[PDB]
Ligand binder design. Structure first.
Ligand SMILES: Nc1ncnc2c1ncn2[C@@H]1O[C@H](COP(=O)(O)OP(=O)(O)NP(=O)(O)O)[C@@H](O)[C@H]1O
Ligand SMILES: Nc1ncnc2c1ncn2[C@@H]1O[C@H](COP(=O)(O)OP(=O)(O)NP(=O)(O)O)[C@@H](O)[C@H]1O
Ligand code: FES
Ligand SMILES: [K+]
Ligand SMILES: [K+]
Ligand SMILES: [Mg+2]
Ligand SMILES: [Mg+2]
Lengths: 612, 121, 614
């Protein structure tokens, strides 16, 4: 039965008191320094974000006052001998009251207070990074003691010295000689001294915040040298620094063949740029260096996959000021905003590829034979139908009604197709030479219906999964043949009975089709593409057969030879019919590893040539 | 003075933005072994150790010293170095045979391929 | 361009002050309820963890004095009509002071004080989940009003009331009729009404808290019905329990073919159990870890850290560890030394277990290998250190020529039983054992008196090249060995070879004569045959010949070559067709054909124009 202990018999009689929520700071500091950030290296990223926020606040205050703008930059100092790292900025700075209010209070951020005093939410809201109030305390992950020398930008503010050992207690004092801005001294821990090295600090800074809006100097050397080109207008930015930005983000030295600059705000604020490499994709590729940004700082999700898996051949950067973030400055897993951003990016990239195909046939064709497998994988892995047709609009195939060297899409293929026809025919062969001479094409050559020729692998599976385009079905040539509704009748009956006797285990059914002229034999099955690809699966890996039907050509000379050669050499006749079956299986693509057929072919060749 | 010009193919997977590029190496033939493998070892210990090659017995028994020269696959520890000053040796790896041995193919999205099979069957 | 503004001119000029850290409670609540947990359903997981902690505390308190133990269960109540979810537990409860100190303070947990007051750290330290102090406030993610009925288990405590809307202000009061323990009523938000349904709550509890230490009741009916069998000793758990647990964790109706119960504490506290499915692996298994973490008997839900190596994803089970570092979101801390050492320990333990299973039984391990070989192949391919390479390679089973058909042999025993004077291991790739025994490369190698392994599955030679070494013995394929190692009349052979090279100059870069072949008229040899075969699958005929150099190598003693010797003059066209056909056959025997459909037409032409004389 049901055993429930929930009851409503309880009642309230006592006076209702009132209390304010408390928060002990010892455990909060312990949580921030130990169980908040997975990476120990994010503390300088947080400090650089704080410096950028301070510089932005100073810039906003100065432009509000409308006076001269002094130099503003972020300086990083590394001292291996002292085991310390120093970050200094020329921002607004903090008074003693400001230092106590901000530094001494957990989750209290002056950035949010400054943003609440903007009244426009566009001048600096897009550039202020701080939103939680725990970014500074990430520095206690590596520092046994922190010295902060901050002097406010107000004309007359005094410098102040800030000490904190990270043990829940901090002290402040008056400081003399402190320049305008904020100077932070970090004394590294015994086990975290790797941050007192120039190389590691430079690498991690370039990883996190090399796109900080203000100049950044480490040990006196600036390493930015490159503005965030995804913020500026596409017309302002030129192709030369597009190439430079591509060479930096993709860690390559080639040029991007395609450059898409996406900047929309109505659905959600996106400032993203995408590139397509000139060189063919490497097998390593087969977050794809499209790591998400927010207010010009790295997020390194690698789990939400802001960009579709098949769209991993493109390189670039995506920026969004409204993405939700963890307390550790990481994306919220399985967030609705993330999913809608991914969908919008995929739709925009599909539209951009369609436009590129429309405006450049030859360049897009080269791109397709360079990156077709990615679109094939996207069609295979897709679930929504409209996504399937959107990706299929990017497919390029060459039909039988056109000369070699030019390719066409499914849309313009169906545009020129007859009104009565309501299905699309496609044939699969390694080359167009084989496709034109393929027995299935010859069998279907009776009608004038156009047929597409696809050569690359996984085309069978891609077309099978698509299964529809513009309300038109995709039927393979073999499927059309199987669903379709000199060797006299008696000798032909006896001869197919011969195959049925000698190929009963392999060939389940033998029949004669009058639609063959050059190929002596044909193998047709209902699930031709599915069976062909599943056989490749099975032979590739032993994991979790089929119903083959062989059709002979009555008018073929090779088949006609069996009539006179059966009575002379029964064994040679059996070997020849076995070889014919193997050749038909190979042509159908349903054959297994053909190393076994080699011995039979050699034996047949040596045995059947004792006449010259 | 017999300076030999060697044009050795180089590709470092760990290099940032490495692309196929051509380099020329000059080694004196008066102080180097006649065999091709000796020149490769000479630059490894003296000129540049970046180039990696496999050699065990420097005699022609293990086969680790086999690469392609002048579009022809040969053996470095058996075939000697050409003495022509004007002619430059074309030191290439095996015809293509790139880092595929260490590319570690993933072959992902394999279940989705099966998921597209059973609706037809 | 090297300028810096860093200087040590700063110094203290006044008397130093002293201050204590503060905390903005409103912003802390907003952060916890808005930007802490990725999934909005973790609030009931946190509440169930709190209930389990309270029940464990009560159990410890009642065992310390050795008195009677009353019922201990966690009840989930769903009220769709009122849009509320009620959690009730019969644990210790909380007094007014305890309610104010614990509930009213952020990041303040009474479990830490309870753990510090154990004085043993050996009985309840492994059964207490709460360690941060923010788990309760996760309820504010979906609740606009949280109502708590709590009274302590002390003899004479009074019921108390606890209301809070999550806006940083909570009001306390005194309640009557409250049962001993703690009952929390959550009033769901307008958009979070999905948690006021049976199905959603059941799904989340089955996701997170099936294996709580105490019985759990959802809407009056118990829904656990399955104890955590990875806690006690392997001798105390039966085979039926193992089968049921495997069925639950793997979501399959079969039985586990292999059962491993790992319980180690010297490197780190691990209580892990692993199963190998009896059925063959599915395509979901081969596509990306099928192992669920459980810290203090609650799910961690990593799904991305891959606590187990990618090649070992074919096994199903759970791993318990009380030492793994969890972030504030109760998720695994990515890039952790402890989790990396846990992964290494699990990998080496599973390798040792598989080796021990292979030693114990032969037919069962042979079936396991022929079922899950591709996973070990992928592990060999993806490994970097040679130690793990050899450890995984110890699991390989390849039948050799020295043994009859259907007798798989290991690499270690092959190395042990071969010659000690040569550091060479020879392997041959063929679709079948019969093909390997009649392979032209094997026949050419028959001059040497040595044992050769046979490979049949795909991506096998690829792993042989990745391994590259085993017990200080090199791995060399038969084709590589023979190409590395150095009837018809002489002049007739020379003119025949010249004619073939004339008609195969572009396709074949070199043709030689070899007397080792006996039943194969020709053989294509490439130096890196194993690498070339796999390279072909990723990268018409002229380009392939240029990037492969198919060095032909024919056998004059073959009757086909003898027949071609005289067919070269009578039928030059048929001779050209036949030399093309034999080149294609040798290429196929080498496995150097991307698609054999092209040769079908010319083979048919050869057949129709060759045996027409019959
Ligand atoms: N270098 C600095 N110069 C001036 N003000 C600073 C500086 N560093 C920190 N602050 C102030 O101190 C506050 C506390 O720092 P922090 O913890 O980073 O909050 P936040 O950056 O605004 N939010 P978060 O995203 O968690 O970092 C900031 O919000 C600033 O108002
Ligand atoms: N249902 C309950 N019954 C009794 N005591 C409770 C209950 N829920 C919470 N508490 C107490 O209140 C404290 C605050 O709750 P909580 O935020 O979950 O802390 P915690 O569970 O110990 N650490 P965490 O892992 O973040 O949940 C707990 O540590 C308990 O001491
Ligand atoms: S070093 Fe052994 S083959 Fe050259
Ligand atoms: K702060
Ligand atoms: K608490
Ligand atoms: Mg910050
Ligand atoms: Mg808890």
């Amino acid at each position: 039965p049901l055993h429930s202990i929930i009851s409503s018999t309880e009642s309230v009689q006592g006076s209702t008191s009132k209390h304010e929520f408390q928060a002990e700071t010892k455990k909060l500091l312990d949580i921030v320094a130990r169980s908040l950030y997975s990476e120990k290296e994010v503390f300088i990223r947080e400090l650089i974000s704080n410096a950028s926020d301070a510089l932005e606040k100073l810039r906003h205050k100065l432009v509000s006052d409308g006076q001269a703008l002094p130099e503003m930059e972020i300086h990083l100092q590394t001292n291996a001998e002292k085991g310390t790292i120093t970050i200094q900025d020329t921002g607004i700075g903090m008074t003693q009251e400001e230092l106590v209010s901000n530094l001494g209070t957990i989750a209290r951020s002056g950035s949010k207070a400054f943003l609440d005093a903007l009244q426009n939410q566009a001048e600096a809201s897009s550039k202020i990074i701080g939103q939680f109030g725990v970014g500074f305390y990430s520095a206690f992950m590596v520092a046994d003691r922190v010295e902060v020398y901050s002097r406010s930008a107000a004309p007359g503010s005094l410098g102040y010295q800030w000490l904190s050992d990270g043990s829940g207690v901090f002290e402040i004092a008056e400081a003399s000689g402190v320049r305008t801005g904020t100077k932070i001294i970090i004394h590294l821990k015994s086990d975290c001294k790797e941050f007192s090295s120039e190389a590691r600090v430079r690498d991690v800074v370039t990883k996190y915040s090399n796109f900080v809006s203000f100049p950044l100097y480490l040990n006196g050397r600036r390493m930015n040298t490159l503005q965030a080109i995804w913020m500026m207008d596409p017309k302002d930015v030129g192709e030369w620094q597009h190439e430079e930005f591509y060479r930096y983000v993709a860690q390559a030295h080639d040029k991007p063949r395609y450059t898409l600059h996406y900047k929309t705000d109505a659905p959600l604020n996106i400032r993203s740029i995408f590139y397509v490499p000139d060189m063919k994709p490497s097998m390593f590729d087969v977050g794809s260096s499209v790591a998400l940004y927010s207010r010009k700082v790295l997020i390194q999700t690698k789990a939400t996959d802001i960009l579709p898996k098949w769209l991993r051949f493109i390189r670039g950067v995506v920026d969004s000021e409204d993405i939700p973030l963890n307390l550790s400055r990481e994306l919220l897993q399985e967030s609705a905003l993330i999913r809608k951003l991914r969908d919008v990016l995929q739709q925009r990239l599909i539209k951009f590829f369609i436009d590129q195909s429309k405006k450049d046939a030859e360049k897009y064709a080269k791109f397709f034979e360079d990156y077709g497998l990615f679109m094939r994988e996207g069609i295979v892995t897709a679930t929504e139908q409209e996504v399937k047709e959107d990706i299929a609009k990017l497919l390029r195939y060459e039909s039988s009604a056109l000369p070699s060297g030019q390719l066409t899409s499914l849309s313009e293929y169906a545009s020129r197709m007859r009104a009565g026809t309501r299905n699309i025919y496609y044939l699969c062969a390694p080359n167009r030479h084989l496709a034109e001479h393929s027995p299935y094409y010859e069998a279907m050559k009776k009608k004038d219906t156009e047929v597409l020729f696809c050569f690359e692998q996984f085309d069978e599976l891609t077309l099978l999964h698509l299964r529809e385009f513009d309300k038109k079905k995709l039927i393979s040539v073999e499927t059309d043949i199987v669903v379709d509704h000199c060797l006299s009748e008696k000798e032909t009956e006896e001869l197919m009975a011969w195959m049925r006797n000698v190929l009963g285990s392999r060939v389940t059914n033998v029949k004669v089709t009058l639609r063959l002229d050059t190929h002596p034999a044909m193998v047709t099955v209902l699930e031709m593409g599915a069976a062909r690809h599943f056989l490749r699966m099975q032979q590739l890996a032993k994991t979790q057969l089929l119903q083959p039907t062989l059709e002979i050509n009555p008018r073929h000379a090779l088949i006609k030879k069996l009539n006179q050669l059966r009575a002379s050499e029964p064994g040679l006749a059996q070997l020849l019919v076995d070889q014919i079956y193997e050749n038909a299986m190979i042509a159908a693509g349903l054959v297994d590893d053909p190393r076994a057929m080699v011995g039979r072919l050699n034996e047949l060749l040596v045995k059947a040539l004792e006449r010259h | 003075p017999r300076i030999k010009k060697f044009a050795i193919y180089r590709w470092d997977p760990d290099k940032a933005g490495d692309k196929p590029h051509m380099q020329t190496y000059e080694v004196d033939l008066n102080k180097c072994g006649p065999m091709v493998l000796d020149a490769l070892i000479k630059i490894k210990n003296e000129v540049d150790s970046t180039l990696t090659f496999r050699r065990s017995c420097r005699e022609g028994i293990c086969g680790s010293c086999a690469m392609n020269i002048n579009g022809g696959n040969t053996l470095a520890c058996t075939r000697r170095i050409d003495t022509n000053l004007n002619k430059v040796s074309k030191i290439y790896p095996l015809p293509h045979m790139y880092v595929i041995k260490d590319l570690v193919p993933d072959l992902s999205n394999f279940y989705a391929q099966y998921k597209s099979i059973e609706p037809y069957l």
